[PDB]
Design a protein around this nucleic acid. Structure first.
Ligand SMILES: Cc1cn([C@H]2C[C@H](O)[C@@H](COP(=O)(O)OP(=O)(O)OP(=O)(O)O)O2)c(=O)[nH]c1=O
Ligand SMILES: [Ca+2]
Ligand SMILES: [Ca+2]
Ligand SMILES: [Ca+2]
Ligand SMILES: [Ca+2]
Ligand SMILES: [Cl-]
Length: 901
DNA sequence: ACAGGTAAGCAGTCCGCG
DNA sequence: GCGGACTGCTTACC
């Protein structure tokens, strides 16, 4: 089989690499790598190395890696460009793997792990590691085994072995309910003492050394804690065994509130799942406890126990171990759904970087572009330094706040990358400039055609049409992968809607779910086979379909993220190819494109309706238009259609047959006008939106930019079983609005768009009446805890102190003394509650770490002195007023004037 | 340091206001 | 005694 790397590191003048050989065997080697850089030389001097502009370079081989760096320095000490890949790991990878890497994941050792530390001192600090490690569950992807290391004796109690027979049993039967499918995969190891526990774990680490190291919060807690515990006990030399090469960097970086520490383990690629999740999940969560994320992701419960966690090992060691095992499995369950490790392997190898570098779009693209260039014997430029300059981005239309009954939207496919490809924007495709008319002259086709020779952006830049450019070339590739997985995604979604429809005719029948690939539109026979199936079998299929979709979502949205990131990278001063000329060429062309088609789309319909100079496009952001479809519908009359589904099927056909071809012609012209390389501005219909037929519903509304709600029947060719609410920017979407309140505002909106005003009033009446009975956690606000210190000033609110920061201050003050209550972690999320007039906290609000319940030390005073009125007013009524005003409705019954009857 | 800009709403502070 | 203008902060939308 083809060879592939596991990990690479540079230590002094040597490169350390773990890899899989041509026989599937894991090997390590240290290489005295001889790097090669480049300097400009005279035109006459004939070589085969040219920089990106076509200027000739000379290659310089260095005896060791230090020599190469010293030269770079000496060249800056002179003032001449020092060219080539300065990060030697990437050049080594590029040299050692001159082909497209096809890896075998079953050969890659991914370790998933978690530890427990009993601590009656408050949170056990990794930097200090004062308390014993008393459990380690470590899953190995190669062995398919959960390795459990369990301490029975410690300063904080002595405990009987864990029982796997009990662990397996129901909660409802006094067991722990550890899943069947992993019961047989547990390797249990009791330990007399911590010394042996740790000593054994290290020898285990040696024989099954992780390549990919993951888990929950593993980089802020488990890794640092185990490193430091071993360091405190056996010395830093032993602790260094956690690195296959024995080298570790310790980034001290503290804060005002003590000492936090991050350890780098050379030879291992650490991918903390919380960071994977934050980067790839595209959620903004109110809390990042595993319980919370497990629940959100897998719809599994809370992992319940009695008393605090600090007292769990002693009171119930049985459950203490099972819960540690389950925590590890949970991350695995999340990864089987989200596929983030898989994604990271794909990108890492695609680009030829350290896998952990996937967190860096700049590092990722530098390498892709580097390798691409290396293939044509071209030489990359030196990374220079620049001042940060702001630059303009997208255009957003200011909309008329209002209800809108029938709405149809249209969106451009991968716009910024498409613009890159259409215009041919790349560091070496720059041809010159032209003098720019103000933007609106390009929008309305008044300004003279900028060039007859080059491809142009309304920002005044001109690019060669004939050549290629690495950026377009490399961007097009990742785009095509994007399009592939999007395709799989949408079809899985389409299929999922068909299963939903079928769940109205569930057959009284005993069968198994169909063996089908959900990435592809179901065939007629499969469809025919589906109606006759049972509920039990249909639901299994639905679940699978969704699972396919999530998988496809992950692959698609994150390639999109990466390609959009190149476009922004052009405007990050650390990117090798930083260049505001190019970044600005992207954004400005975007602004023109959007407004150009707004002109065209208003023009077309005004002709097609005979009407004169009416507005149809009511909104647009960046690359989207929202078209007011009322006149098209009225041209036929709501009298007809019989059902909702008729007029949707109408509008759809009108979009695909009439609008798009006009839209296409519009973008053809603009491409011509701009004289671009290839037309790639593709705008197809997205959402079809309105109320159920002849209902009291308003269909949709806007409040301003970035804030609207629509009742969507069809989205990108997916016809929903039930109409789905598209809500953008409103409080229902924000992680800072109380859960109960999101839910209720969503129903108010649902009731606004699907049913009428009465329905909405009826609900508002109910909600307010019932509000005081909801759980405190459900009605609490959420916020991040940035810059606590800055505003601290004696433990009381400093100047211009933010509302939430104030609330933490009241917390801290109220938990003074008993270091036992959890401390608000700086930069983490908190619940916030307003405090009622004249309370014992001596301030007007309180905050505490999210996920958690507040410690009982203050819980009951918080519940009593709770300010429901200010909560209701601020978080619910206020935003509702916003929605209904814009919608021209009232949430409360108005004074009839007739009431005197 | 190690993708980008655009933009909304909520509070705090300071000022004008018979 | 409070509303408006401005700014800090937070979290959305592309
Ligand atoms: C979502 C997003 C968009 N954008 C910019 C670049 C996008 O080309 C443009 C429009 O964004 P989107 O409409 O969200 O998506 P897209 O055009 O990139 O791709 P698609 O429509 O197929 O999903 O806005 C970013 O710069 N960063 C981002 O994270
Ligand atoms: Ca734990
Ligand atoms: Ca689309
Ligand atoms: Ca788009
Ligand atoms: Ca869009
Ligand atoms: Cl230590």
């Amino acid at each position: 089989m083809k060879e592939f790397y596991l990990t690479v590191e540079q230590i002094g003048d040597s490169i350390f690499e773990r890899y899989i050989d041509s026989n599937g065997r894991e090997r390590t080697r240290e290489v005295e790598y001889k790097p090669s850089l480049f300097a400009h030389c005279p035109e006459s001097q004939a070589t085969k190395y040219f920089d990106i502009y076509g200027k000739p370079c000379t290659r310089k081989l260095f005896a060791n890696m230090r020599d190469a760096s010293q030269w770079i320095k000496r060249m800056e000490d002179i003032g001449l460009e020092a060219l080539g890949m300065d990060d030697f790991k990437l050049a080594y990878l590029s040299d050692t793997y001159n082909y497209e890497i096809k890896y075998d994941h079953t050969k890659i050792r991914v370790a998933n792990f978690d530890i427990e530390v009993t601590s009656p001192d408050g949170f056990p600090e990794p930097s200090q590691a004062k308390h014993p490690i008393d459990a380690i569950t470590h899953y190995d992807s190669i062995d398919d085994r959960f390795y459990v290391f369990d301490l029975l004796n410690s300063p904080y109690g002595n405990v009987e072995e864990w029982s796997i027979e009990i662990a397996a049993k129901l909660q409802e039967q006094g067991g722990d309910e550890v899943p069947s499918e992993i019961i047989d995969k547990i390797i249990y190891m009791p330990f007399d003492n911590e010394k042996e526990l740790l000593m054994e774990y290290l020898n285990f680490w040696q024989q099954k050394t992780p390549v990919i190291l993951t888990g929950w919060n593993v980089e802020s807690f488990d890794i640092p804690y185990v490193y430091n515990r071993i360091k405190n006990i056996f010395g830093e030399s032993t602790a260094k065994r956690l690195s296959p090469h024995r080298k570790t960097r310790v980034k001290v970086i503290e804060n005002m509130y003590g000492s936090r520490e991050i350890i780098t383990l050379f030879g291992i690629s650490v991918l903390d799942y919380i960071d994977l999740y934050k980067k790839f999940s595209f959620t903004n969560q109110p809390s990042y406890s595993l319980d919370y994320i497990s629940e959100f992701e897998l719809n599994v419960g809370k992992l319940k126990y009695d008393g605090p966690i600090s007292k769990l090992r002693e009171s119930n060691h049985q459950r203490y171990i099972s819960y540690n095992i389950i925590d590890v499995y949970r991350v695995l369950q999340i990864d089987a759904k989200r596929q983030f490790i898989n994604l990271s392997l794909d990108m890492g190898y695609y680009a030829k970087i350290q896998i952990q570098s996937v967190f860096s779009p700049i590092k990722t693209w530098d390498a892709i572009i580097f390798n691409s260039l290396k293939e044509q014997n071209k030489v990359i430029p030196q990374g220079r330094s620049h001042p940060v300059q702001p630059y303009p981005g997208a255009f957003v239309k200011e909309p008329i706040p209002n209800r809108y009954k029938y709405v149809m939207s249209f969106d451009l496919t991968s716009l910024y990358p498409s613009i890159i490809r259409q215009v041919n924007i790349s560091p070496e495709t720059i041809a010159g400039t032209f003098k720019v008319a103000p933007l609106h002259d390009y929008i309305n086709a008044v300004a003279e055609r900028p060039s007859d020779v080059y491809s142009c952006s309304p920002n005044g830049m001109m690019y060669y049409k004939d050549r290629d450019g690495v950026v377009p070339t490399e961007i097009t590739k990742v785009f095509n992968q994007r399009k592939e997985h999007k395709g799989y995604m949408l079809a899985a979604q389409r299929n999922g809607e068909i299963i939903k429809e079928a769940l109205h005719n569930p057959n009284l029948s005993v069968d198994e779910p169909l063996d089908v690939d959900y990435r592809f539109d179901f065939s007629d026979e499969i469809k025919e086979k589906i109606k006759k199936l049972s509920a039990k079998s249909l639901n299994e299929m639905l679940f699978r379909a969704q699972r396919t979709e999530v998988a496809g979502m992950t692959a698609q949205i994150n390639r999109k993220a990466l390609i959009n990131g190149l476009a922004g990278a052009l405007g990050n001063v650390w990117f090798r190819y930083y260049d505001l000329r190019n970044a600005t060429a992207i954004t400005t062309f975007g602004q023109m494109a959007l407004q150009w088609i707004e002109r065209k789309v208003n023009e077309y319909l005004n002709e097609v309706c005979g009407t004169e100079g009416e507005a149809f496009v009511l909104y647009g952001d960046t690359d989207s238009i929202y078209v007011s479809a009322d006149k098209i519908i009225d041209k036929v009359g709501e009298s007809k259609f019989r059902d909702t589904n008729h007029w949707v099927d109408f509008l759809d056909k009108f979009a695909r047959e009439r609008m798009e071809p006009a839209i296409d012609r519009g973008f053809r012209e603009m491409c011509e006008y701009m004289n671009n390389k290839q037309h790639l501005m593709f705008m197809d219909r997205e959402a079809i939106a309105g109320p159920p037929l002849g209902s009291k519903g308003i269909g949709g509304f806007w409040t301003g930019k970035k804030r609207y709600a629509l009742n969507v029947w069809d989205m990108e060719g997916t016809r929903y079983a039930e109409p789905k609410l598209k809500i953008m920017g409103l409080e229902t979407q924000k992680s800072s609005t109380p859960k109960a309140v999101q839910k209720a505002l969503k129903e108010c909106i649902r009731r606004m768009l699907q049913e009428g005003e009465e329905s909405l009033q009826e609900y508002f009446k109910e909600f307010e009446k019932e509000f005081r009975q909801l759980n405190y956690i459900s009605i609490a606000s959420v916020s991040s805890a940035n810059n606590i210190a800055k505003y601290d000033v004696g433990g009381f609110p400093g100047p211009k102190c933010p509302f939430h920061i104030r609330g933490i201050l009241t917390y801290n003050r109220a938990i003074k003394g008993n270091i036992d209550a959890p401390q608000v972690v700086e930069g983490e999320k908190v619940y916030v509650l307003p405090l009622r007039e004249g309370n014992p906290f001596g301030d007007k609000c309180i905050a505490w770490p999210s996920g958690t319940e507040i410690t009982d030390l203050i819980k009951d005073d918080v519940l009593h002195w709770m300010d429901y009125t200010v909560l209701l007013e601020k978080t619910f009524i206020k935003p509702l007023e916003g929605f209904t005003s814009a919608a021209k409705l009232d949430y409360e019954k108005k004074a009839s004037l007739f009431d005197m009857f």
